From a paper:
The temperate phage lambda, which infects the bacterium Escherichia coli, belongs to Siphoviridae. The virion of the lambda phage comprises an icosahedral head and a long flexible tail. The tail, which comprises the tail tube and tail tip, connects with the head through the neck. The neck–tail complex comprises a channel formed by stacked 12-fold and hexameric rings and a 3-fold symmetrical tip.
The portal occupies one of the 12 vertices of the icosahedral head. It is formed by 12 copies of gpB, which exhibits the canonical portal fold of phages belonging to the order Caudovirales. The dodecameric portal is located at a unique icosahedral vertex and facilitates the transport of DNA in and out of the head during genome packaging and delivery. The structure of gpB comprised 4 domains: wing (residues 24–249 and 368–452), stem (residues 250–279, 343–367), clip (residues 280–342), and crown (residues 453–511). The tunnel loop, which was previously indicated to facilitate the dsDNA translocation in the portal during packaging and stabilize dsDNA to avoid leakage during the phage maturation, was well resolved. The asymmetric reconstruction of the portal and capsid at a resolution of 4.0 Å showed the asymmetric interactions between the gpB and gpE subunits, as observed in the structures of phages sf6 and T4. The portal–capsid interface was analyzed using the PISA server, which revealed the salt bridges between the gpB and gpE subunits. Superimposition of the models of the 12 portal subunits revealed that a loop (residues 208–218) in the gpB wing domain underwent structural morphing to adapt to the portal–coat interactions.
Author numbering:
A (entry chain h): 99 to 341
B (entry chain Y), C (entry chain X), D (entry chain W): 24 to 301, 320 to 513
E (entry chain a): 321 to 374
């Protein structure tokens, strides 16, 4: 019923394209942002893009990865204090630490310890308050209560490369860090003669469209951003594999 | 009731419209409607004429202020109220009609021009927006400057879909009220606007930051609908009819003859039309009587009447269109067929009621909100001094302090003498005062009295006889 | 709403005009639009009449100055304000209306001529430009000289593609305001290519150095749109129709008769039409009766009606064009069909509303800015002296010192007696002053009073009767 | 905007006019346009009638001077100014009304004739030239003389092209103002080649030597364009249509019969027409009844209506032409359909506005410049004397000393009594004065007062009743 | 297949083809007068005058 002239249909189709372009650019920005934190460096590559490799010097003493010794899975789930290692890992950071980010598998591994359970129900031995029970099951982020001083965060975001969905954080990593860490959000200069004729430069998401008068007609649409995500102090975080 | 059935003999079995609110019937095709309305306004003789009639008769050439604060309610005293009103009117007159045109940000218009543009925007768009902003770096006396916004600019951010609270870029709270508007920036080189900026309707201090004026039709109507929607189809179809008729008349009147013969077409025109081969031109001097052999034959085509009744149909369609738009058929079509005085006066009255309604609502509301937004800063910067012994401060009762009535241009009567006679006869009796009659001519009676008082002494200085109004 | 849908039966399926702002709808075809407007004005009977009506009714033959400074806002005193007004009016009347025509550098116009040119340019181009400059070589009292800049001159430099801040040769700052105008030199035959120069809108001292007048349609309109876009197509098509019809009438009336025979081409004309072989010319003296054989024949052609309904359809098109432009049909077409007094007065009112609007806006703004630009030299050059104890200096409130209202030419009434009776009866009552009544006839009332006060003395000296206005 | 686009259905795909100023559109084809307009003025009745209307209504039968120097600025005094004005008016009235026609070198005109010719030559050519020289050998009171130069003479020397500083025979300085003019020689015979001279516009003292009067349209315009360019084509085509229709009517009405037979040409006319053999003339007496054998026949040929709708088409074209020229339709075509008083008065006033504008600009400016050129001599040769204690010398301010107002012939009202009644009604009230009323009849109130003061004495001495205006 | 309404067109017909511009009757051939008669009848029946009814 209802229905519309072949022109309404063109306006609707034209929009959802704008939405998809914005979502793709936002995904690229977030992927750069996350990859800049987990490890010191991240590489930008493509099929038509000459590879460029941004590298911020992070000391080898960071990026702590568990090994045949000092791993949480193999060790007993009763009679063990996770809190002791956390302090040892966080000693390596420069500056205070005020937040912890868990991949949900890592969070399930961490809260399974009985000692951390004991730290919750002590009358005077701590001020930590968590929410061990289920809190969020559809949302991407779940701000759990402060554990001691630092806050506890579980992030399960999804970026889709090809048809298949993928998770951002790589399968139970834990990232110590500071909630006020100095991060830079740098946007370069767009390279389009039409844009520069218009007078615009160093802007994010310059949109345009044009008609190509081809055999089937056609008018396209294009967003171009040129993003670059930096970290002023790369060694303010401490990435842990936590296997 | 046969209205809601199938019809007389099943003729209305297809006409089954859905019952929808104004929002669901207007918003999905809002932009196309606005675009078509603007297209008609720009490129039609009748649409531009209708807009010009709106602007010239609703508002006119000058749009003046009369400040009347409610003295009894505020409990301040009559004479102090009059003095305050005089100071405020002087200040506004100084600020309203600045020749440098600094009242608007773009420095292209004066006040009454802004009112005229507001009326026009309310004509073919259904709504008008004025934004009141400050210039901190400005070193003149009054910082407040107003900026016009076309309704094309206020739309959703980043091409989002219409939601319960945000419709067509206008945010709506739980009730029907509005909180703020999303305004883009239309830039000429290229299209597909880039960024959207949020600006609220009211500052936390109660000051007006965004002015939205329109008349609703139903319960919940986020944005208005222009007046052209009743006659958008008929005007386009009439334009097509006129252009096609003109082209057809040109083509039918273009072929004046037809030559039938057997010889070569050059010699056929040489021996019949009268040309020379020294196709080919034919000189238009004198008269000619060609000589024809039996095979030859000459035809002088005759065409149809150039206006075979198009002029009568056009009259009917213009009557329909003028009924839709609001202006009388006589003003819209410039016809003015021979008629009596009674019919002319009746048509003028029936248009006048509509024009006065429009002026009393749209232009008056816009002007009053502008005046109040200026008056808040005027009081704050102490260019004027409020009366003391005030029950309510300025913030508590804003409309009681800035209650103003505007006087626009007066009607031009068909008869010059009759209107003067009737005004004089009302003056002789107690039916009407001086203010009503001097307002019907676009005049503030206080200024007239001051001019008369100056002139009587001017005359007495030169030795002329005192005027009639002079007291003995 | 069916306005924004497919339409009646899908007839409007292809009518999808793009929703674009005025800047993106005017500028891409600017020069061609202005050129077509000029071509229509330069080669049509009706367009030149419309321009002449605009010039003659908006302004007329004299455009007088009436200076009324705002003394209360400044606080100087009534007598000092009047002394200053009289002095400045005398100085301006000397400077404006010189017969040496040295107000503009080309020495070809007076002041009223310049106002009329401004109105005309605002008619068929949509915008007017005036450049105010100085001449240090001139030894006269006042060094101010003005100029008229054709809108074609001001364009983007070297035809470089358009930009964001610099649109169509007019520079725009971050807000909507304009700062400078790129204007080129114009030499028609050749020389070095056009050199585009910079001319700032206003000098550092606040003086106005470049003038641009046009009424906007939307929020942002960098350059104006002419009045002809509504009806440019129809006037061209009417021109084509009229020329084609006239040529067709000539062609149809040219071929008077027709001869069919079987003899030689000249013998048949010798024996039938009566020409002489002593084509073959025929003498028009007297009557003739040929002699024919069975083979021959003579036919007297009959042509269609020369004017078969073309007049009525031209009437319809002129009504449309008159609605589009603004002038009433009776003025544009010179028809003046049998109409009563009521219809004529109503049509005159319809024309006069628009003419008053244009006079109040276009010519008035140009004249006010010109007068202020001149008054700055005067005040500075001590040709006139400011009143004492001024609350503000001249540069602080320019509008305060130069607050002026201009008098144009009045209306020529359809019936002369009735308007005079109306004015007299209004004067007898208190509704209107002498200043307004004498202003509606284009007279300055102070000059009139001086005239009567001198005429009474002249009559007394010569021995005649005292006049009616004299005081016993 | 559809005006600047392709058009309705692509019909305006080829309407692409050049964008060029008045110079690039006028100078290449100046002489051809002037020659065609002169052809139309010389060889068409209607255009000559329009020119006569221009001459008679713009100027009339007299062009009187009224000298009103601005005495207030000069600081000289009212009484000295009045005496100076009287003296200079008397001197001008005696100089320019010489029965021997010695104002102009050619001794063929008077002042009023010269002003009328200036107006006419403005009308059909677009400019008027007046050259001011001296005849040193002459022994008269004034040695100033003026020669009228036709615009055709001003041309580039040696018929070369237009250089940057010399357009169309007029020198142009760095600004648009003119500096000097190139004048050819009057060559009546084709042979005797022409000599080109050089005439500076102003003598080094500032006195006017060569006068150029014309109204510009755009910024830079070396020479103007005449009023006929709007309707050059239509008048020629109308003339061709008229001549062709008249010739066709004569041809169609010539052949009153046609003879069919099989006998000799002589005998067939003998037996049927009734001619005599002693082709064959026939005498018209009586009514004749021929006798026809079976083979013969006689056809009385029939023609169409002679005037089938030609008059209404002539009406439409004449309305168009009149609208182009500026004269009212009834003044141009002498039609005068049955019309009420209101319509006639409306038409007369609509033409009168234009006529008053033309008189105020063209004739007034030319006469003022000529009068200033004469007043320099009067002052220098001490024929008249300047008021003593003058602030400025004459040369420092020519306009102030020579400021003058001219009065033409007054209009002839449609109704005789109503104009007089309104004049008396105005004079009785204060809305006007004696000078303005006496000026509307083309009279000077001072002369009327002198005549009345003479008449009252003449009546009193002779024994008659004193006049109405006489004082007891 | 839908035509485009813009323009003035002159078709080129082969000998077989043809084009017919139908002429219809007066869309109001005397209906107003019959309405007048019937409305006068109805007004006489109901009591209100003809002007006040029609």
């Amino acid at each position: 019923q209802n229905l519309a002239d072949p022109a309404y249909r063109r306006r609707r189709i034209i929009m959802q394209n704008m939405r998809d372009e914005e979502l793709a650019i936002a995904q690229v920005e977030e992927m750069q942002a996350v990859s800049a934190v987990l490890k010191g460096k991240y590489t930008m590559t493509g099929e038509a893009f000459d590879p460029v490799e941004v590298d911020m010097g992070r000391s080898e003493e960071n990026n702590i990865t568990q090994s045949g010794g000092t791993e949480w899975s193999k060790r007993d789930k009763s009679t063990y204090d996770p809190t002791d290692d956390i302090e040892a890992y966080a000693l390596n950071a420069s500056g205070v630490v005020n937040i912890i980010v868990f991949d949900p598998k890592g969070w399930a591994l961490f809260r399974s310890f009985k000692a951390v359970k004991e730290k919750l129900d002590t009358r005077r031995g701590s001020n930590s308050e968590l929410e061990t029970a289920v809190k969020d099951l559809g949302k991407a982020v779940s701000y759990k209560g402060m554990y001691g001083d630092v806050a506890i965060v579980v992030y399960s975001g999804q970026y889709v490369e090809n048809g298949v969905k993928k998770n951002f954080l790589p399968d139970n990593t834990m990232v110590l860090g500071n909630t006020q860490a100095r991060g830079l959000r740098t946007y370069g200069c767009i390279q389009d003669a039409d844009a520069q004729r218009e007078g615009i430069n160093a802007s994010a998401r310059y949109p345009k469209n044009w008609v190509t008068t081809g055999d089937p007609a056609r008018e396209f649409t294009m967003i171009q951003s040129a993003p670059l995500m930096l970290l002023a102090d790369p060694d303010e975080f401490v990435s842990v594999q936590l296997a | 009731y046969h209205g809601g059935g199938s019809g007389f003999g099943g003729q209305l079995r297809s006409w089954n419209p859905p019952s929808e609110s104004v929002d669901a019937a207007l918003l999905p095709n809002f932009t196309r409607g606005n675009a078509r309305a603007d297209d008609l306004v720009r490129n039609n003789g009748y649409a531009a004429n209708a807009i010009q009639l709106h602007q010239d008769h609703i508002v006119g050439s000058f749009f003046r202020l009369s400040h009347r604060p409610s003295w009894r309610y505020l409990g301040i005293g009559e004479e102090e109220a009059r003095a305050f009103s005089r100071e405020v009117e002087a200040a506004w007159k100084e600020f309203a009609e600045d020749d440098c045109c600094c009242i608007d940000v773009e420095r292209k218009r004066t006040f009454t021009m802004m009112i005229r543009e507001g009326v026009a925007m309310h004509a073919f768009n259904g709504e008008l927006f004025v934004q009141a902003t400050w210039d901190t770096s400005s070193s003149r006396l009054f910082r407040t400057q107003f900026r016009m916004v076309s309704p094309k600019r206020i739309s959703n951010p980043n091409n989002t879909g219409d939601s319960r609270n945000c419709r067509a870029g206008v945010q709506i709270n739980d009730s029907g009220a509005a909180l703020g508007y999303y305004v883009s920036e239309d830039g000429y080189p290229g299209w597909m606007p880039q960024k959207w900026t949020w600006i609220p309707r009211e500052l936390p201090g109660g000051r007006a930051s965004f002015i939205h004026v329109f008349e609703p039709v139903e319960d919940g109507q986020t944005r208005g609908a222009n007046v052209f929607y009743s006659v958008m189809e008929q005007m386009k179809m009439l334009d097509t009819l006129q252009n096609t008729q003109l082209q057809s008349a040109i083509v039918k009147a273009m072929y004046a003859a037809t030559i039938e013969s057997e010889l070569d077409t050059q010699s056929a025109m040489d021996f019949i039309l009268g040309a020379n081969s020294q196709a080919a031109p034919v000189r238009l001097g004198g008269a000619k009587v060609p000589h024809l052999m039996p095979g030859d034959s000459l035809n002088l085509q005759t065409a149809q009447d150039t206006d075979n009744g198009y002029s009568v149909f056009e009259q009917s369609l213009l009557r329909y269109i003028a009924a839709g738009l609001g202006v009388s058929y006589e003003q819209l079509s410039r016809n003015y067929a021979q008629m009596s005085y009674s019919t002319a006066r009746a048509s003028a009255n029936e248009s006048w009621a509509y024009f006065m309604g429009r002026r009393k609502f749209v232009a008056s509301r816009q002007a009053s909100q502008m005046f109040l937004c200026w008056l808040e800063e005027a009081i704050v910067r102490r260019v004027v001094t409020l009366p003391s012994k005030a029950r309510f401060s300025f913030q508590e009762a804003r409309s009681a302090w800035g209650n103003c009535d505007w006087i626009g241009s007066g009607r031009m009567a068909i008869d010059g003498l009759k209107e003067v006679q009737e005004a004089v006869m009302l003056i002789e009796a107690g039916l009407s005062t001086y203010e009503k009659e001097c307002a019907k001519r676009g005049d503030d009676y206080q200024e007239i009295f001051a001019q008369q008082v100056r002139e009587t002494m001017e005359r007495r200085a030169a030795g002329l006889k005192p005027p009639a109004w002079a007291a003995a």
